[PDB]
C-alpha cells in the first residue's frame, strides 16, 4: 500500500475511533487483557494524578493471571507516576 494512502486511511480510522468512543462503552477489561497477556508487559506504567488504573490492573492480575504469571516466570511491575517516581525515573535511595 502507498505510504501517503496509508496515512490518509489510518487518519480517518483514528478520527472515527475517537468520535464514536463517545457512545460505545469502555472495554477496559478486554484492553488490560491485551497488554497483560498478548503483550506480556512487565512494566505497566500509569500516567495520572492518582493510582486508579493501576489498582485496576493489579486486581485483574490477582483475579486472572495468578497462574499464568507463576508458570511463565514473569515478574510484572505496576507503577503510577503519582506515587512511584523513584521506580520510573530510576533514582533510588542508597
Amino acid at each position: 500500500m502507498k505510504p501517503e494512502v496509508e496515512q490518509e486511511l489510518a487518519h480517518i480510522l483514528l478520527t472515527e475511533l475517537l468520535a464514536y468512543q463517545f457512545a460505545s462503552p469502555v472495554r477496559w477489561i478486554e484492553t488490560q487483557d491485551v497488554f497483560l497477556k498478548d503483550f506480556n508487559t512487565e512494566r505497566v506504567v500509569e500516567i495520572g494524578p492518582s493510582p486508579t488504573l493501576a489498582g485496576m490492573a493489579q486486581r485483574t492480575l490477582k483475579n486472572k493471571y495468578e497462574s499464568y504469571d507463576a508458570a511463565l516466570s514473569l515478574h510484572r511491575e505496576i507503577l503510577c507516576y503519582s506515587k512511584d517516581a523513584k521506580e520510573i525515573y530510576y533514582t533510588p535511595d542508597p
Binding site: S67, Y68, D69, A70, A71, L72, S73, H75
Partner: protein
C-alpha cells in the same frame, strides 16, 4: 533475576531437579499438571523420583521448575505459623521444597534423544550384561522386578531406566531382608 529471587525465598539455587516433601504424590502431580498447563512440550516438568510416601522429586528445565516453585510458594505456609489454636481440619499445608545438587535432568523427556545413541555406543565397546552372568537378583528401578527375567537387553533396560523412566523407589525395594548395605555416595545424606 531468578537466582536472586529463588535465593531470598529460602529455596535452592535453581537446578533441573526439585524435591518436594510432605505432599501426596497426587498432590504434587496436581501442582505440576497446573504448571505444565501453560508450557510447551519441550519445557515441561514431570515426577522423576517417588522416593517415598510424601517425598517426591520433580524434574525438567530449571526455569520451568522455578515456575512450579512460584505456584507452590503461595500454596504453602510460614514454618512457625503456630496453628495450634486452629482446629486440625482447618489448618494450612506446611511443607518443604528445595533444588537438588545435579547438572542434568535425569529420568525426563529431555534425555530420551540420548537413549538410542548411548546404546549404539555401548555396543561399539565390549559392554553388555547377559542374564546368564548376573549371580544375584538385580531389582528393576521401575518394575521392582528382576532384570534377569528379561526378553531383551539388560543393558538397554538400565539405560532407559536411568534416562527416561521414573524411579518408583519403594516398589523397586519390594524385597524383604534383615539388612541393607549402602555403598552409594554421601554418608548419612545418602540413599541408605
Amino acid at each position: 533475576s531468578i537466582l536472586e529471587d529463588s535465593l531470598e525465598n529460602n529455596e535452592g539455587v535453581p537446578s533441573p531437579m526439585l524435591s518436594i516433601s510432605n505432599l501426596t504424590q497426587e498432590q504434587v502431580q496436581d501442582y505440576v499438571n497446573k504448571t505444565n498447563s501453560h508450557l510447551p512440550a519441550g519445557k515441561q516438568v514431570e515426577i522423576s523420583l517417588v522416593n517415598g510416601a510424601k517425598n517426591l522429586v520433580v524434574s525438567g528445565p530449571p526455569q520451568s521448575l522455578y515456575g512450579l516453585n512460584l505456584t507452590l510458594r503461595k500454596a504453602k505456609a510460614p514454618s512457625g505459623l503456630d496453628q495450634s489454636r486452629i482446629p486440625f481440619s482447618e489448618r494450612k499445608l506446611k511443607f518443604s521444597n528445595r533444588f537438588l545438587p545435579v547438572a542434568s535432568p535425569f529420568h525426563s523427556h529431555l534425555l530420551v534423544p540420548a537413549s538410542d545413541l548411548i546404546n549404539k555406543d555401548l555396543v561399539k565397546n565390549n559392554v553388555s550384561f547377559n542374564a546368564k552372568d548376573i549371580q544375584i537378583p538385580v531389582y528393576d528401578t521401575f518394575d521392582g522386578s528382576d532384570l534377569r527375567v528379561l526378553s531383551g537387553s539388560i543393558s538397554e533396560r538400565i539405560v532407559d531406566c536411568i534416562i527416561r523412566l521414573p524411579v518408583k523407589w519403594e516398589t523397586t525395594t519390594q524385597f524383604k531382608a534383615t539388612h541393607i548395605l549402602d555403598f552409594g555416595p554421601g554418608g548419612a545424606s545418602g540413599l541408605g
